Design a protein around this motif. Structure first.
Motif, PDB file in Angstrom:
ATOM      1  N   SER A 188       0.800  -1.233   0.000  1.00  0.00           N
ATOM      2  CA  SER A 188       0.000   0.000   0.000  1.00  0.00           C
ATOM      3  C   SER A 188       0.847   1.305   0.000  1.00  0.00           C
ATOM      4  N   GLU A 189       2.031   1.293   0.598  1.00  0.00           N
ATOM      5  CA  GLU A 189       2.907   2.465   0.605  1.00  0.00           C
ATOM      6  C   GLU A 189       4.066   2.427  -0.384  1.00  0.00           C
ATOM      7  N   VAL A 190       4.242   1.348  -1.137  1.00  0.00           N
ATOM      8  CA  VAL A 190       5.389   1.272  -2.055  1.00  0.00           C
ATOM      9  C   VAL A 190       4.960   1.539  -3.488  1.00  0.00           C
ATOM     10  N   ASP A 191       4.174   0.658  -4.086  1.00  0.00           N
ATOM     11  CA  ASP A 191       3.825   0.830  -5.502  1.00  0.00           C
ATOM     12  C   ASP A 191       2.364   0.514  -5.834  1.00  0.00           C
ATOM     13  N   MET A 192       1.481   0.723  -4.862  1.00  0.00           N
ATOM     14  CA  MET A 192       0.072   0.330  -5.011  1.00  0.00           C
ATOM     15  C   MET A 192      -0.611   0.916  -6.251  1.00  0.00           C
ATOM     16  N   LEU A 193      -0.192   2.093  -6.704  1.00  0.00           N
ATOM     17  CA  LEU A 193      -0.842   2.722  -7.861  1.00  0.00           C
ATOM     18  C   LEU A 193      -0.502   1.993  -9.166  1.00  0.00           C
ATOM     19  N   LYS A 194       0.767   1.649  -9.339  1.00  0.00           N
ATOM     20  CA  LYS A 194       1.218   0.948 -10.529  1.00  0.00           C
ATOM     21  C   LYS A 194       0.601  -0.448 -10.574  1.00  0.00           C
ATOM     22  N   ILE A 195       0.579  -1.127  -9.424  1.00  0.00           N
ATOM     23  CA  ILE A 195      -0.097  -2.431  -9.254  1.00  0.00           C
ATOM     24  C   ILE A 195      -1.564  -2.381  -9.704  1.00  0.00           C
ATOM     25  N   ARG A 196      -2.295  -1.363  -9.258  1.00  0.00           N
ATOM     26  CA  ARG A 196      -3.685  -1.167  -9.701  1.00  0.00           C
ATOM     27  C   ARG A 196      -3.733  -0.973 -11.208  1.00  0.00           C
ATOM     28  N   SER A 197      -2.897  -0.060 -11.699  1.00  0.00           N
ATOM     29  CA  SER A 197      -2.766   0.221 -13.131  1.00  0.00           C
ATOM     30  C   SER A 197      -2.584  -1.052 -13.965  1.00  0.00           C
ATOM     31  N   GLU A 198      -1.561  -1.826 -13.621  1.00  0.00           N
ATOM     32  CA  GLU A 198      -1.266  -3.070 -14.317  1.00  0.00           C
ATOM     33  C   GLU A 198      -2.390  -4.088 -14.206  1.00  0.00           C
TER      34      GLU A 198
END
Length: 308
Positions: free
Chosen positions: A265-275
């Motif tokens: 949730s604090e490292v790369d959660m946005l890119k994970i959602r994106s992908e």
């Protein structure tokens, strides 16, 4: 609303409410950074005299307990604890095991090592040894050291081609078992470098890196190297897959989904959602919401962070 003293008061209130108020506990804790939650634990103990992790243990249960207790650990403590967890049994979950260790940097791995020893009174390397065997043990031991190279300023094209061929030569030209060679290249080169190695490998193999592996080493180091390479190539995509694999099918492997959401949730959660959206057409928000229920789900949803 980052005021530790007020946060701690509201949580004390919520914990001493007849029958507990989980809605509040979740709204607070899943909407503060790990560092902010640490100041709250401190202020909570200072205020109530009991440790917050301890108070919530009694107050909480099921999957929500698991989620909330994890969130209260610092990243290193968390990783340390999930490595213990997943390497118990003969040392069972070999997937979970790379998940946690691939995807941390050298410096996170020195903290993990240091803390692990502190919480468990035994070096991480010794339990890995105990709970794994064969070449997987050799791989995991070397990864856990966190001794990758850092970064040369210009892209070191020279060494890439050499490694590319050497991986191909050991893996699949010669082929039985210069697995040591794979272990070292995969553990001692930087991630960016290995990303390029994986591109140039296509020039040497008729298949891409992942395809080339499928059929080689079988002994978990097949499946372990399919995980490590995905993880190196594209972390967000890698966690997105693991997230989906945990939520596919009748029910849920809630260990993997919880660990990931808390841990990322604090490292790369946005890119994970994106992908995740691109690869499966649906958002991460949606599979969670659907696949989980109760206060447990809104805790995940908050850690997911956004409606897509």
């Amino acid at each position: 609303n980052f005021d530790a003293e007020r946060d701690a008061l509201n949580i004390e209130t919520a914990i001493k409410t007849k029958g507990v108020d989980e809605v509040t506990i979740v709204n607070i804790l899943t909407n503060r950074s790990n560092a902010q939650r640490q100041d709250i634990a401190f202020a909570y103990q200072r205020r109530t005299k009991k440790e917050l992790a301890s108070a919530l243990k009694s107050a909480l249960s099921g999957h929500l307990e698991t989620v909330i207790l994890g969130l209260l650990k610092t990243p290193a403590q968390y990783d340390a604890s999930e490595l213990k967890a997943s390497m118990k049994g003969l040392g069972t979950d070999e997937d979970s095991l790379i998940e946690i260790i691939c995807s941390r940097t050298n410096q996170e791995l020195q903290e993990i090592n240091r803390v692990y020893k502190e919480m468990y009174k035994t070096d991480l390397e010794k339990d890995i040894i105990s709970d794994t065997s064969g070449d997987f043990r050799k791989l995991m031991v070397a990864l856990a050291k966190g001794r990758r190279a850092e970064d040369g300023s210009v892209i070191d094209y020279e060494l890439i081609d050499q490694d590319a061929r050497d991986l191909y030569d050991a893996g699949v030209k010669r082929k039985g078992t210069d697995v040591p060679k794979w272990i070292s290249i995969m553990t001692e080169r930087s991630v960016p470098h290995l990303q390029k190695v994986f591109d140039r490998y296509k020039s040497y193999s008729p298949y891409d890196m992942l395809e080339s592996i499928r059929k080689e080493v079988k002994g978990d180091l097949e499946n372990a190297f399919l995980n490590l390479v995905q993880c190196i190539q594209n972390k967000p995509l890698y966690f997105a897959d693991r997230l989906y694999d945990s939520m596919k099918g009748k029910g849920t492997r809630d260990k993997v989904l919880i660990r990931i959401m808390v841990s990322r949730s604090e490292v790369d959660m946005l890119k994970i959602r994106s992908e995740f959206k691109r690869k499966y057409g649906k958002s991460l928000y949606y599979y969670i919401q659907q696949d989980t229920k109760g206060d447990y789900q809104k805790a995940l949803l908050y850690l997911c962070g956004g409606d897509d």
